Enzyme design. Structure first.
Site, PDB file in Angstrom:
ATOM      1  N   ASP A  64      -3.365   0.444  -9.115  1.00  0.00           N
ATOM      2  CA  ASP A  64      -4.279   0.825 -10.211  1.00  0.00           C
ATOM      3  C   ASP A  64      -5.399   1.657  -9.563  1.00  0.00           C
ATOM      4  OD1 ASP A  64      -3.633  -1.250 -12.639  1.00  0.00           O
ATOM      5  OD2 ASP A  64      -3.756  -2.519 -10.855  1.00  0.00           O
ATOM      6  N   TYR A  66      -9.252   2.754  -8.513  1.00  0.00           N
ATOM      7  CA  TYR A  66     -10.471   2.015  -8.231  1.00  0.00           C
ATOM      8  C   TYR A  66     -11.202   1.699  -9.527  1.00  0.00           C
ATOM      9  CZ  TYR A  66     -10.223   3.503  -3.272  1.00  0.00           C
ATOM     10  OH  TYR A  66      -9.886   3.681  -1.922  1.00  0.00           O
ATOM     11  N   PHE A  77      -6.289   6.047  -3.695  1.00  0.00           N
ATOM     12  CA  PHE A  77      -7.117   5.695  -2.525  1.00  0.00           C
ATOM     13  C   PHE A  77      -8.245   6.664  -2.219  1.00  0.00           C
ATOM     14  CE2 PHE A  77      -3.047   3.545  -2.049  1.00  0.00           C
ATOM     15  CZ  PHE A  77      -3.470   2.235  -2.008  1.00  0.00           C
ATOM     16  N   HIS A 187       5.776  -4.134   4.094  1.00  0.00           N
ATOM     17  CA  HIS A 187       4.894  -3.514   3.108  1.00  0.00           C
ATOM     18  C   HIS A 187       3.496  -4.134   3.036  1.00  0.00           C
ATOM     19  CE1 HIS A 187       8.692  -1.769   2.000  1.00  0.00           C
ATOM     20  NE2 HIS A 187       9.176  -2.973   1.763  1.00  0.00           N
TER      21      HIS A 187
HETATM   22  O1  LIG Z   1      -3.800   0.490  -5.208  1.00  0.00           O
HETATM   23  C1  LIG Z   1      -4.892   1.116  -5.152  1.00  0.00           C
HETATM   24  C2  LIG Z   1      -6.029   0.505  -4.648  1.00  0.00           C
HETATM   25  C3  LIG Z   1      -7.211   1.222  -4.634  1.00  0.00           C
HETATM   26  N1  LIG Z   1      -7.232   2.471  -5.093  1.00  0.00           N
HETATM   27  C4  LIG Z   1      -6.158   3.051  -5.540  1.00  0.00           C
HETATM   28  O2  LIG Z   1      -6.261   4.235  -6.005  1.00  0.00           O
HETATM   29  N2  LIG Z   1      -4.986   2.362  -5.584  1.00  0.00           N
HETATM   30 CL   LIG Z   2     -11.148  -1.415  -2.102  1.00  0.00          CL
END
Ligand SMILES: O=c1cc[nH]c(=O)[nH]1
Ligand SMILES: [Cl-]
Ligand SMILES: [Cl-]
Length: 223
Positions: A64, A66, A77, A187
């Site tokens: 998901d 942040y 990320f 993983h």
């Molecule tokens: O799974 C993740 C966790 C942090 N941020 C993201 O974009 N995805």
């Molecule tokens: Cl985080």
């Protein structure tokens, strides 16, 4: 239409879910009408699909976006260049980057150069309600991102998959049709930290796998 929202290759790859993408647009509008917010910004929701489908060589999967306001930017990320400090997940990624590749810490948290170079920074779910982690699970994104992953796996091109959202038993079947797909196992996710993530060597292993499949390595170096 999809052709106006994403890159040409992706528009073709996502055609089977074009109606579901339209439905998610309706969902997001209905959220604002209902008085709830969403992240990332509308213009960034599909950002991962604005880099060319045919040139993707590494898939990095998250779960998901942040949930903290101002963090999600539509690449899994990544954060905007003015975000500081980095979220813990990204700080952990960067520690591994320095350990694996020997590069110094990046200047900021913007992973755009990886996207430019063929790293698909894909979340399974592309929006979230701010401050409410995982709040848009089961709202329709999973079908869209499954279509994306299956389309990538069906290409004749090499692909290395890195699974940073756990959920491996859900994802691996989507990557199975592939003839030139290598999945990094085990993983660990970034928040696994010293219980499997640090020392997982995801970047150098991806390049070893790419070169073994006849592809060019990714230049992982960030500014
Ligand atoms: O799974 C993740 C966790 C942090 N941020 C993201 O974009 N995805
Ligand atoms: Cl985080
Ligand atoms: Cl809200």
């Amino acid at each position: 239409p999809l052709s106006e929202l994403v890159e040409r290759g992706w528009a073709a790859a996502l055609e089977p879910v074009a109606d579901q993408v339209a439905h998610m647009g309706q969902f997001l509008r209905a959220e604002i009408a209902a008085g709830r917010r969403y992240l990332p910004a509308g213009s960034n929701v599909l950002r991962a699909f604005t880099f060319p489908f045919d040139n993707v060589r590494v898939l990095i999967v998250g779960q998901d976006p942040y949930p903290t306001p101002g963090h999600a930017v539509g690449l899994s990320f990544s954060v905007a260049p003015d975000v500081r400090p980095w979220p813990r997940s990204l700080a952990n990624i960067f520690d591994e980057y320095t350990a694996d590749l020997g590069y110094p810490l990046p200047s900021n948290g913007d992973l755009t150069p990886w996207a430019q170079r063929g790293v698909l920074l894909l979340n399974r779910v592309l929006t979230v309600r701010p401050s409410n982690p995982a709040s848009h699970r089961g709202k329709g994104w999973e079908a869209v991102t499954e279509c994306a992953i299956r389309a990538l796996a069906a290409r004749a091109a090499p692909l290395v998959a890195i699974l940073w959202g756990r959920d491996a038993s859900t994802l691996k079947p989507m990557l199975a049709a592939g003839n030139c797909v290598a999945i990094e196992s085990p993983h660990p996710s970034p928040l696994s930290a010293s219980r499997g993530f640090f020392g997982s060597r995801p970047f150098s292993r991806a390049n070893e796998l790419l070169v073994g499949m006849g592809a060019e390595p990714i230049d992982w170096r960030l500014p």
